[model samples]
Target: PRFLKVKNWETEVVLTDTLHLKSTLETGCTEYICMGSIMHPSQHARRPEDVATKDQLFPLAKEFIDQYYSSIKRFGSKAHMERLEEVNKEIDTTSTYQLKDTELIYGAKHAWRNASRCVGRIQWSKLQVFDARDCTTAHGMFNYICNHVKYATNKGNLRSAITIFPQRTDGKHDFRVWNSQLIRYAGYKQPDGSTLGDPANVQFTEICIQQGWKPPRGRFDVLPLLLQANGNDPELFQIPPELVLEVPIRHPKFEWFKDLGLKWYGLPAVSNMLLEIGGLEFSACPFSGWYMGTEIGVRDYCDNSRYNILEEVAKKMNLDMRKTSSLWKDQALVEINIAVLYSFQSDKVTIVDHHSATESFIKHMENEYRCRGGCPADWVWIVPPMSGSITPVFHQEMLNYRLTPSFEYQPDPWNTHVWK
Candidate 1:
C-alpha cells in the first residue's frame, strides 16, 4: 500500500503508490532499497486498478473539464457546460472520450506537478507535451520517441518533455516503451562476479542482447530502446550516439576527480509508466526532466550495489576509510556532489543541486497550497540522498496523496502481452 515499489529495468527508481515508512516495515530489504527513495524489489506487477468504466468515465471527465476551465478562469460558464455536453456525447457514442489537443498538454503538465516523488516540481508548468496518439506500429512509436529524446536532451540544455503514444483503447493495441529510462547504461555481469557498466541495468541489458544487441561491454555504454506497439512483440531501436549528451564529471578543485572517468547522461526520462488523465490511460507516455546532482553523485555513484565509488573517493582524498571517525564518507560525498554540479555546469548541461532543487520545491509547495489548499509530497524522496537535515524540506511538514491527471505505474508490457 505504500510506494508500490517498482523494480523494473532500472532496479527501483520509480515509487508508484504510497509512501509511509511503516508500510515498508513488512519487508527486510525495504529498509535499504527504499530508504531514501521508495523503490520496490518486485518486477512485472499488474495494475492495482484506478481506470474507470463507461459510466464511471463521465464523472472523471467532468472533473477534469472543470479543472481545465477553472485554469482559464472560465469555470461554470456556458462554454464550459456546452463543452461538457460534447464530451458526454463523445463518450456515450464511443465508450471513450478524447481530450482536446490543448487539454492533453494541460493534463500532462499537471501529471508532473502531481508527482509526489519529484523534487523538481517547481518547473512542472513548463513541460513540452508531444502527442503521438495516431501511431499504429512500433516503428512509428520509435520515431516519436527519438524526437522526444532529441527535444528533451536539447544538446544538454535539457528541457522537460513527455511523449504520449496511442492511448490504451483496448488490451490489443496498447503501446509501451519497455526501457525504464529513455537513456540507460548497459550492465554486463562478468565471469568474476563483477559487473561492467551499470549493474542496475543487467537484467535489461540481457533482454537487449537476447533481442539482437551486441554488448560493447564498456562502462557507460548507452543501451538501445525496446518499444512495443499494438500488441506486437517488442522490437529494438538504437539511439544515435550524437543524440545522447553526456557530461564527464570532474571536480572544480580536485584534478584527480577526472581520472575516475565518471560520466552521466544529461536527461532523466522515465519511459515505462502510465499517464492517467480524466479516466483515460496512456501506457506509453515517457516524460523527462533534468537530473539532480545527488541523483548521480549520491544514489547512482554511492549506492553500494551500484557504482560504489564512495570509498575510492575517500581514499583518493587520503581520508582514512578504516575509521568512521574520519567522516571520510561525508567529505567524499560532498566533493562528488560538488563535482557533478561543476561538471554539468561547465558542460552547459541542465542539472540542479540538491540544495537549490529542494529549496525550489519549498516555493512550489507554497504555491500549490495557495492554489489547491494542499501539496502532496513524500518525505523520504523529498529529502536528499545525503545531508538530510541540511535541507529545509526535511523539517517541512508534508502530506502524500495521489492526485488525478497524474502519472501512474503499469505492469511491464512483456508481462501480460499476447503477441501476434
Candidate 2:
C-alpha cells in the first residue's frame, strides 16, 4: 500500500500516484510499478492573483496627509494629527475632509503649482478661490460659474481664479459640471458634413440642443453653461453675453485677416477636472487663467484635427503650396499666432506669448528650486509646438514627478452616469 502526497518540484516532471508499468532496460526486471500524478516541468514561476487590500490605501492616505500639513505649515499640531487620523480612516471607504477657507485657497494655489504642464505656474499664488460648497442646486452652480467668469474676466484684466463645490463623500451626492469649459463656441454640423464653427465642440453642442438650449445661427455662438448639483440631472443655463469677453483676431500686417471673422474668449476656464486636496475630490471645481497665444492661434485654429485653417490662410498669403520647402503652412501659422497676440493686446485683454511665458517658466523653476528643493515639469509640453528650437525650455532637460494637492483629469461627465 502507498499514500500520495503533494510536492513542489523544479517548479523547478514525471511522477506516479499509482500504477503497474513496463520495466525499463536499466531496471533489469520484466515488470515495474509506478505511482504518481503526471506533472509537467515548469520553466517560469506563476504570477499570484491580484486581490484588493487595505494596505495600499493606507500609504496613499498618509501621503495626502503629509502633503497637506506640510503645505499649510501645520505638520505636527495635535489637533491636526487627530484630524489626519480621522481622514486616513475615512479615505479608503469614504472621502470627507473639512477644509477652511484658507486651506482651500492654499490648496487650490498649490494645485496650480503642481500642474506639471503649465508654463504659467509663476502666477499660482495670485489665484482667487470661490467656495461654493453650500450650494445645492444646478442653478446655483451656474450662478457661481457665471460669477467666476465675470470676476476672472475682470473687464479684460483676466485674473486667475477657481470656484470649488462640495467634495465627494460616502452616502452623499457628488457635484459635477458637464461642460468642457465655462466659455466655448458652439459647433454646428452642416448638411454638407462641414462644421460651422469649432469642430471640437460639436458633440457638446448637440447635448445642449437636446437639453432645449436655443443655439444661435452664427458660427461664433457662445454655448451656455451645463451643470449638475448634488447628483441632480444636468441642466443648461444661458450665459450673459456681456459677461464673456471675446477678442476679434486681426494681424498687424495683414489687412484681409480681419475679414476672416475669427475670435476667441479672453480667458481659458477649464471646468471639469477634479481638484484633489488632502484625499478629497471636488468634482465641480472650475478654474481659469489668461490665455496663451499659441493655445488659440496654433492648437485651436491651425491644428489639422481641429479647425484646419492652414491651407486657407496659406492661400490668402499667396504662398505656393506645391513645394514643401515653401513653408507656407509655417508662415501662415506664425502670422495667425501674431494675430492672436496683437488682437489681445489691442483689445486690452491679458495674454501671454509663448516666448515670454517659457522664459518666466525657467525663472519659476529657479525659484522653486530655492524654495521647494526641486521643480517637476514635462519638457514635451513645456516647449511650444511651433518654433520650439528657439525656446529656452527646449534646450534644457526636464524632470517629471507626482506631487500631491494637484488638479487631476477625470472622466468627462457626459461619458459617465455621475449625474444619476
Candidate 3:
C-alpha cells in the first residue's frame, strides 16, 4: 500500500494568528500618520508642522519614514520610536480644550501627532508586536532588490521568501496567502551605497513577466501590490515638480532633515532634487503630482509648496539628499492610512470636529449618500489660491496661498485655468 501526506502551501494560518493578535492590540491604541522626513538628531528634529496630524499630513509623514529611515537593519524600530518621541515634544498633542490653538487641537486629535512620538516608541519596545522594522518599509526595499535581481540575472523569479499565513476569507481553505519574500530582503545591506538597498546608488530592471506562464495576472499586477504591502509607492506618486520636505518655524524637517541638511564634507545646497507644481484649482479634497528626486512612490492628498522649496535648498547645498529617504536612512517611514472626514463651510480643506456629517447630508437631502460611505471627494477642492492670506512664494495664484506655505510669489499674473 502506498500512502501520501498532503502539505499545506498557503500562509493563511500564520497570518491569521498574527493579524488576530495585532487587531486585538491596536484596538486600544490610536492610529498614527505623517508625511516625509521625520528622522532627526534630537526630539525637535522635523518641522513643527511635519509632526502635526491632519488628513494628508499624517499620511505623508508615515510615507516619508517608511521610505527613508526604517529599511536598514541597524536603524530599526528603536531608532524610529525615539524619533517619534522627539516629534511629540515639538508639538503638544492635546485636545483643542487641552491646548491653546487649532494646530494643537488637530495635532492631539489625530494619531499622526502620536505616531511620530508615541506609537514609534511603542513599536520599538514591543518587538514581536511590530515587525523587526516597519514591515511595509522592508517590503518596499525588498521588492526593489528582487526586481533588480530578476532583471540583472534575467531569472524572472519574483518570490524572494515565504511565510505561513492564516486565512482571512471564509473557512473554505485553512490557510491565508502572504508574500513574506519581501521581508527577507528587509534591513539595508549596503554599507557605502553600492547596492539596490541603498537609495543613493542602485538599479533595477523593470520586467514584464506577464508574457510568461503566469499569463493572466503576471508580475506587473503583483508588483504594485507588493510595493504597497511594503509601503513603497514613493516611486510612482511622482508627477514632476516634487516636494520633499517642509520645515516648520521653530521646528526642523528631521534630526538629519535640516533646512540645508545632508551637506557633503565641502558641498553647498545640492542634495537630492525633487519635482514641484502649484496653482492647482481647489476642491474639498486634495491630490498629488509631486516627485522626490527622480523617483515618485509616495502620494499626498493635501500639498504645501514649502516641501518643494526644501528639496530645492537640498539640491543647492550639494548635500546627500538620501539622508532623509527611507531608501537610505531609518527615520522617515509610513503606512497608507486612508480616511474620510468632515470639512466646514470655510474654503479649502478645513476639516473640523464641529461640522456635522449628518447635517451636511440632511441639508442636501441625501441621507443615502452619507450612509454609502459617501464618495471620494476631489482633492483639488481643498487647494486654496496662492496670493496674500498665507503667502506661498512658489505659487503666485490669487486666493490665500496657504497649505504649508514657505515661499511668497505671485502666481502667473496671466495664469487662468479653464474657469479662471
Best by lDDT: 1
Per-model TM values vs. the true structure:
0.86, 0.82, 0.17
Q: Residue-pair clashes per candidate, as listed?
A: 2, 7, 96
Candidate 2 wrong stretches, greater than 4 Å: 1-62, 72-74, 85-95, 170-172, 418-420
lDDT of 1 by residue, 182-217 (tens): 998999999989988888999889989998998888
**Model 2 lDDT, residue 395, Cα:** 69
Better of 2 and 3 by lDDT: 2
The digit string of per-residue lDDT tens for model 2 on 129-171 reads 9999898899899889889999999999989999999876541
What's the distance in Å from true for residue 140, model 2?
0.5
lDDT of 3 by residue, 1-420 (tens): 122121112211110111111110111112363222222212211222222343323333333333234324434478666554444443234310111132222221222111211111111111111011112343443433333333222221111111111111111211111122111111122457432221211111121122121212211111111222221122221111111121111112233223323211000111111111111111100001111111110122112311223343334434566645533211121110011110111112222221232123122212212332121111122222211122121111111111210111212111211111
- The residue ranges of model 1 lying beyond 4 angstroms of the native Cα positions read 1-52
